[PDB]
């Protein structure tokens, strides 16, 4: 039995570093619409579907849609891989 690593196996570590950096990049963009606050809101975005509270489009809400599409694709690919 692998420890920890087995979960990590389906998707490469590099890909993880990439999704992390990419998410961090997405995170700040919401703040641009407005170091802690909206970054925390993005933390409230990845957690659930993607983004909220945008007064109809504005700017970053479409970022939320793209991000939703994004995380959707990745998790799908992951599950397929483990399968």
């Amino acid at each position: 039995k692998p420890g920890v690593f087995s979960f990590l196996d389906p998707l490469a570590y590099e890909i993880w570093m990439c999704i992390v950096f990419a998410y961090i990049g997405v995170s700040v963009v919401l703040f641009l619409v407005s170091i802690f606050n909206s970054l925390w809101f993005s933390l409230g975005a990845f957690m659930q579907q993607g983004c909220d509270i945008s007064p109809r489009s504005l700017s970053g809400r479409i970022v939320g849609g793209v991000w939703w599409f994004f995380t959707l694709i990745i998790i799908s690919s992951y599950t397929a891989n483990l399968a």
């Binding site: 950096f21 961090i24 990049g25 703040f31 170091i35």
Partner: protein, 179 residues
């Protein structure tokens, strides 16, 4: 007022550090350590980004390899690097203008933030392209140089460090424009 100044200058210096990482990986000495100690004979590759060294001790060019469309990916890569550096320098320039007013503002600072974001957006794509290319270079039987110690960095991680330098710059300066 000292607070906002300390925040701004701190972000400036951080982005300067990110520029140092940009120069760091733009001046990589060996992107990947490499070996082919064939029981031929012992071998130790040291693949710089434009400079595949071997180690008696030697370093070699080896740049712009197979194949074609990949070369174009290298074109987009290097162009992305140049524009990356440009967005950096425009960032520092807008910072210096902020210093001149310290010696719009907001409207200007956010601009740099945006560009820095764009900068961070490009290099993260760029490295992908590069890594993409690198994997492709490994994928197509790298002439003879196909080391088992496949690994990025050290400097590539610094390229990411310049990335997060621009990132933290954009975040704190956004924290400043939110004021």
């Amino acid at each position: 007022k000292t607070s906002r100044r300390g925040r701004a200058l701190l972000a400036v210096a951080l982005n300067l550090l990110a520029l140092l990482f940009a120069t760091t990986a733009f001046l990589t000495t060996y992107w990947c350590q490499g070996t082919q100690r064939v029981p031929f004979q012992l071998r130790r590759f040291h693949t710089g980004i434009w400079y595949s060294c071997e180690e008696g001790e030697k370093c070699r060019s080896f740049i712009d390899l197979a194949p074609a469309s990949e070369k174009g990916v290298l074109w987009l890569s290097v162009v992305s690097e140049v524009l990356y550096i440009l967005l950096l320098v425009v960032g520092f320039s807008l910072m210096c203008l902020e210093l001149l007013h310290s010696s719009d503002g907001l409207k200007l600072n956010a601009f740099a933030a945006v560009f820095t974001v764009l900068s961070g957006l490009l290099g993260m794509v760029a490295h992908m392209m590069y890594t993409q290319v690198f994997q492709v270079t490994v994928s197509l039987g790298p002439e003879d140089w196909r080391p088992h110690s496949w690994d990025y960095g050290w400097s590539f991680c610094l390229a990411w460090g310049s990335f997060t330098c621009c990132m933290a710059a954009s975040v704190t300066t956004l924290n400043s424009y939110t004021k």
